[PDB]
RNA sequence: AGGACCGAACCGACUAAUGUUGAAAAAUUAGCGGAUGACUUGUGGCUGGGGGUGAAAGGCCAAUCAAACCGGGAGAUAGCU
RNA sequence: GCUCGCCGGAAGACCAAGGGUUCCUGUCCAACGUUAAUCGGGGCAGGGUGAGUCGACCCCUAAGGCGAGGCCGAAAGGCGUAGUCGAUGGGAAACAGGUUAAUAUUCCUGUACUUGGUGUUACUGCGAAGGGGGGACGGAGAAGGCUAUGUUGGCCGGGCGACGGUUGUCCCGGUUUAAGCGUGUAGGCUGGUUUUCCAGGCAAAUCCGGAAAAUCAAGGCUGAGGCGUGAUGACGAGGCACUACGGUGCUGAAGCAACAAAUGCCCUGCUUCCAGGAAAAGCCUCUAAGCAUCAGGUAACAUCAAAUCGUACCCCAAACCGACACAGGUGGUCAGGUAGAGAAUACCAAGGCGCUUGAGAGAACUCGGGUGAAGGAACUAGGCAAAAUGGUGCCGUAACUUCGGGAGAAGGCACGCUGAUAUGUAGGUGAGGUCCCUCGCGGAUGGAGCUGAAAUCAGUCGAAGAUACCAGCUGGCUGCAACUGUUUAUUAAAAACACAGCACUGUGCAAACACGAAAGUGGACGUAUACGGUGUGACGCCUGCCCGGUGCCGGAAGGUUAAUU
């Protein structure tokens, strides 16, 4: 039974990484909210 | 050329392969070869804008000279090549200056035949002249709609346009569709018809053959659900509606041309 | 070339184990803990100037820090760098 | 030669039993179908919610689908319990 | 430690992905481990990953992404040019042995190689962002030449048997060696060479393309493998001293040939087919500006540089994805023996395991199997399940048919072993020798040796010879769908969907149409033998009647009729 999560570091960073977040206004709002909440890990970045 | 295949298996019983042995069996001319990446009928937004387009065989686009602008220099047909991008067969021609160009091969322009373009060119199949210099009634192909723009009419296979009349600046042309269009006499047109007129006599014979050409299966609208197509579906095979497109527009009879910018050129519409 | 300031910082400390001693006695290789940013050319110059030994080749490996624990919280040791410096024939400590 | 034939890998999933607080939130076992093709597969890419994609089942779109998920309007409104 | 059993196209061995110290050592057993635990992928501590040549980075581009300006859009944005990123693809170079508890193409030993840089000398037309070539490419198929590899012999070392026999025609083991460099062979492609001359390759060009002569055709390119060297070496069965009893040192024989043989190599080949099969750089070459002492270039030579990052360990799994040490999922690489067509299957090798609760008993019942008197579908919704068929050769095979089929129809006979034919044949492989020879990776002949079906005849054993595993049940009539395909991931694989074919209809290109406040993009670098939509659904015979209604197409007199006035 193949499951939904298939780990791939390259794809993970290209979709949920820091640079992908900073590339769009919406993605920067994500980082701002996470910074406002106080998330230690702001992104899946490495 | 039309050759039926013996029924040695289901999928070969109905295949009617048109075989032309004059076609160069080697690789095509490399210097006039570019890349033809497939799109899957999708636009720059990634959305399927044209349905039933996907897969197929890889094709390298052969650059065909539809303008035929090298006037004065004769060319010699070297090989009648095969073009995977068009219904017709291209033809590599060598000019007397050492330049090779691909042209849509006319009906019987075999290797060795000499072709020439320009106003000084002779009235022969494969020679390109402006329609002002071509006699009225002469069958032509690769007709330009604008002078110097390149041919864009009767370029399929076995297609040609008869010059109905000449009325000074413009010339009446009977297109394959049956429409009479006025095109400027300055526009160039190649004498003769397009070759490979046996193209219509081929029979794919099987669903694989359609997929080889990059055509995906067409689902009928009546086989879908009301949310998927206007035809939707009922209990059983239910229709009871005027045939419409997947977007609601009437399909059987409704006209859709809406230009008003090109109507003047049109003399008679295809009956 | 490489300033003596740089050469006086690239070498952190001698490395003491069991493999290091075997190498120091058989392959004439002194294993030395070096700066993370110390390149092989930097390590060579430093060894020859602060130990007065002619060096042949320097092999560098980055040793990842083992993630230990304090009994209640997970902490990670910092990555260090190990340098296998092969002395041509010079003798040392 | 072949969307040819038999048949492992491989890709599927017709039947039976088992299992149904499972070994498993879809499997196991014995059989079964395709197996040079409209095949299958690795990596990356692309299409986004009345939107997509669909050889079309309202299928699929992260164990979620006659309108995903998350947050918000929000303490929606419940002559009902 | 000895038996035993299991896997062996795996349950072995390498990786990539992912994980992240799980690696190895010492130590501890509370918890974790479905039981105990002294043990562990657990706790704790310490140690372990060494590279110019492997990978990344790097140079180069694909799909695609972002995108100066730009175009467009209430805004946020969208698209896209010049560009610039982006591998799953292209681009320089290392192999054999040895070694640690834990890394090794990385350390060591031996022998190599690459690309830059600087310098010397000789010599010289050098020079892009341009031009050309090249890189550079499909499916299938059919060979032949080969190697990996196996087998056999020979050779060398050892052996002489717990129970009848076994100094031999016996038994066991070994019999291995690379990159590189040198040669240039089976095979593949190609005429060659010189000269003159021009609308082309934006300009230019000695390059490419073309055109024309001249003369010669044997030169070029490419290419497995082999042989030579590397290699006086390494490794090596196995011995001998000492033993932290694990070892440790040290020494070390043969190291050949024959045959068989890949799915690997020659082969990016070759033949054929239609569905017509990346790009870019490295690379080779050509010129455009200066300058012609320079600088650049070229060849040899000397010296210098090749950084950084990864390298443990798992990786079909107890380490990844599945909450679990979960009967699941997970791409690539290698591919031994016997039997076999085989990567099936059976049994083994190398290697790895016995699945982290056991001990008893031997009730019903459940599960998974074996057998069954007589009967033989009577069972049941239904032969569900089970049983049966099952290999090869050969004989033989109906209706119907689209002439392919049906068909493996149906049905039936032979099959083990042994001997002879023929102390192993036909076939294949081929040494020596002999001659030729432009004296070689050469040719002719010839056959040693090696391997080796099938068949026939005769005999012989069993109840049975395709003896296990493995391995169609068959026939008859009819519905639906032509067919291979596709689908409700996880109750529906079907008559549903698709399908070739057919038809109607739209559409003249700035096409219809589709996604887009738009720009723009697909359609399509297509052009009516085209594309879109719709219906039907191979093929054969065909497809009647109705336009009153609804829709569509056409026509507009006239009636009606908006904004406006
Ligand atoms: Mg319906
Ligand atoms: Mg129904
Ligand atoms: Mg009905
Ligand atoms: Mg229905
Ligand atoms: Mg810890
Ligand atoms: Mg079958
Ligand atoms: Mg199964
Ligand atoms: Mg079977
Ligand atoms: Mg993907
Ligand atoms: Mg919605
Ligand atoms: Mg919500
Ligand atoms: Mg409430
Ligand atoms: Mg331990
Ligand atoms: Mg780049
Ligand atoms: Mg073929
Ligand atoms: Mg005896
Ligand atoms: Mg020999
Ligand atoms: Mg193969
Ligand atoms: Mg390094
Ligand atoms: Mg590992
Ligand atoms: Mg387990
Ligand atoms: Mg598991
Ligand atoms: Mg399994
Ligand atoms: Mg097996
Ligand atoms: Mg067990
Ligand atoms: Mg019975
Ligand atoms: Mg049966
Ligand atoms: Mg019917
Ligand atoms: Mg069917
Ligand atoms: Mg289903
Ligand atoms: Mg099912
Ligand atoms: Mg139908
Ligand atoms: Mg039907
Ligand atoms: Mg009628």
């Amino acid at each position: 039974m193949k499951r939904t999560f298939q780990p791939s570091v390259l794809k993970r960073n290209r979709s949920h990484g820091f640079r992908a977040r900073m590339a769009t206004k919406n993605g920067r709002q994500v980082l701002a909210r996470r910074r406002a909440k106080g998330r230690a890990r702001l992104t899946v970045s490495k | 050329a039309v050759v039926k295949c013996k029924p040695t298996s289901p999928g070969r019983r109905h295949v009617v392969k048109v075989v032309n042995p004059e076609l160069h069996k080697g690789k095509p001319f490399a210097p006039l070869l570019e890349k033809n990446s497939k799109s899957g009928g999708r636009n720059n937004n990634g959305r399927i804008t044209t349905r039933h387009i996907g897969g197929g065989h890889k094709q390298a686009y052969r650059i065909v000279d539809f303008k035929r602008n090298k006037d004065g220099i004769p060319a010699v047909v070297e090989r009648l090549e095969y073009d995977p991008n068009r219904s017709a067969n291209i033809a590599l021609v060598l000019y007397k200056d050492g330049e090779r160009r691909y042209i849509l091969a006319p009906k019987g322009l075999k290797a060795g035949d000499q072709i020439q373009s320009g106003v000084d060119a002779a009235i022969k199949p494969g020679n390109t002249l402006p329609m002002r210099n071509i006699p009225v009634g002469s069958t032509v192909h690769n007709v330009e709609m604008k002078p110097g723009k390149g041919g864009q009419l009767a370029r399929s296979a076995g297609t040609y346009v008869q010059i109905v009349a000449r009325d000074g600046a413009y010339v009446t042309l009977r297109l394959r569709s049956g429409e009479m269009r006025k095109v400027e006499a300055d526009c160039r047109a190649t004498l003769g018809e397009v070759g490979n007129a046996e193209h219509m006599l081929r029979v794919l014979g099987k669903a694989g053959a359609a997929r080889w050409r990059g055509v995906r299966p067409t689902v009928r609208g009546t086989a879908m659900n009301p949310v998927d197509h206007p035809h939707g579906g009922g209990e059983g095979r239910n229709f009871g509606k005027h045939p419409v497109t997947p977007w609601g527009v009437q399909t059987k009879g409704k006209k859709t041309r809406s230009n008003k910018r090109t109507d003047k050129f049109i003399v008679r519409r295809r009956s | 070339m490489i300033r003596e300031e740089r050469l006086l910082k690239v070498l952190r400390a001698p490395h003491v184990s069991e493999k290091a001693s075997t190498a120091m006695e058989k392959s004439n290789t002194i294993v030395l803990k070096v700066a993370k940013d110390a390149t092989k050319a930097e390590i060579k110059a430093a060894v020859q100037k602060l130990f007065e030994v002619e060096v042949e080749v320097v092999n560098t490996l980055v040793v990842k820090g083992k993630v230990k624990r304090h009994g209640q919280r997970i902490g990670r040791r910092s990555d260090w760098k190990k340098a296998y410096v092969t002395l041509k024939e010079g003798q040392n400590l």
Side-chain angles (χ1 to χ4, degrees), chain B residues 13-14 27 39 41 43-44 49-52 59-62 82 86 97-100 149 152 154-156 176-177 179 197 199-200 205 218 220-222 229 231 242 246 251-253 256-257 261-262 269-270:
Chain B
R13 171 181 303 279
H14 310 280
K27 299 306 175 186
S39 66
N43 69 333
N44 56 353
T49 57
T50 313
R51 304 185 308 172
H52 322 128
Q59 302 168 13
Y61 177 83
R62 293 83 153 98
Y82 169 95
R86 63 196 67 267
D97 53 83
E99 179 172 6
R100 279 175 184 83
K149 177 178 181 169
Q152 45 190 178
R155 318 185 324 175
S156 193
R176 281 288 302 177
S177 72
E179 182 209 84
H199 176 88
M200 55 177 175
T218 302
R220 293 169 290 97
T222 181
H229 198 270
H231 289 159
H242 301 294
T251 296
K252 302 272 184 166
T256 66
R257 173 191 169 93
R261 170 187 54 87
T262 64
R269 290 289 287 178
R270 19 158 277 272

Side-chain angles (χ1 to χ4, degrees), chain B:
Chain B
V2 171
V3 169
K4 299 188 310 299
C5 298
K6 286 195 167 190
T8 63
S9 51
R12 285 286 289 182
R13 171 181 303 279
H14 310 280
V15 295
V16 180
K17 316 188 319 303
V18 174
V19 179
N20 187 13
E22 282 192 350
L23 256 49
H24 180 63
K25 304 180 190 302
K27 299 306 175 186
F29 189 67
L32 288 183
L33 260 187
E34 208 163 350
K35 172 179 56 58
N36 203 11
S37 294
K38 309 307 192 64
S39 66
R42 287 157 163 86
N43 69 333
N44 56 353
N45 302 342
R47 303 285 192 91
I48 303 180
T49 57
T50 313
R51 304 185 308 172
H52 322 128
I53 307 181
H57 205 292
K58 177 153 55 182
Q59 302 168 13
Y61 177 83
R62 293 83 153 98
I63 304 181
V64 179
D65 184 24
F66 302 104
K67 297 174 177 292
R68 293 294 303 272
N69 44 270
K70 267 196 64 58
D71 318 313
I73 350 285
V76 284
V77 180
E78 275 180 309
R79 56 191 179 186
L80 262 46
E81 284 271 30
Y82 169 95
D83 202 83
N85 317 117
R86 63 196 67 267
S87 173
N89 291 331
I90 52 177
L92 193 65
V93 300
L94 176 56
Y95 285 93
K96 305 299 180 293
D97 53 83
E99 179 172 6
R100 279 175 184 83
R101 284 188 171 184
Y102 270 119
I103 72 157
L104 302 173
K107 279 271 304 304
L109 198 69
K110 62 171 182 58
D113 290 7
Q114 290 190 339
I115 64 171
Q116 185 176 359
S117 52
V119 290
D120 72 324
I123 307 300
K124 302 161 54 64
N127 285 31
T128 301
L129 286 92
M131 291 183 295
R132 51 171 63 266
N133 290 54
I134 304 174
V136 163
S138 293
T139 279
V140 292
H141 67 271
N142 206 18
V143 179
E144 304 185 341
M145 301 172 59
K146 300 190 63 177
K149 177 178 181 169
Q152 45 190 178
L153 297 168
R155 318 185 324 175
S156 193
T159 55
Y160 56 95
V161 175
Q162 181 259 350
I163 306 182
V164 188
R166 219 189 299 98
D167 196 7
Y170 283 82
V171 306
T172 302
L173 300 175
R174 194 190 316 267
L175 308 181
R176 281 288 302 177
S177 72
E179 182 209 84
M180 327 285 280
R181 216 194 93 96
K182 269 294 195 185
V183 179
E184 308 184 17
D186 309 86
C187 302
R188 295 185 163 274
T190 311
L191 272 297
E193 310 179 358
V194 180
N196 203 41
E198 318 84 23
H199 176 88
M200 55 177 175
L201 303 169
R202 81 172 63 260
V203 177
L204 299 183
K206 72 175 186 186
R211 308 305 303 272
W212 295 341
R213 285 148 174 86
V215 179
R216 306 196 67 260
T218 302
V219 177
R220 293 169 290 97
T222 181
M224 308 176 176
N225 296 291
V227 68
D228 305 334
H229 198 270
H231 289 159
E235 294 298 316
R237 292 196 181 93
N238 283 1
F239 205 61
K241 45 183 59 70
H242 301 294
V244 293
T245 65
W247 303 276
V249 184
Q250 213 270 327
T251 296
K252 302 272 184 166
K254 174 167 294 300
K255 288 181 168 56
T256 66
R257 173 191 169 93
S258 48
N259 214 329
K260 281 189 291 182
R261 170 187 54 87
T262 64
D263 286 15
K264 40 173 163 288
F265 307 104
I266 319 295
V267 179
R268 176 212 305 174
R269 290 289 287 178
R270 19 158 277 272
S271 300

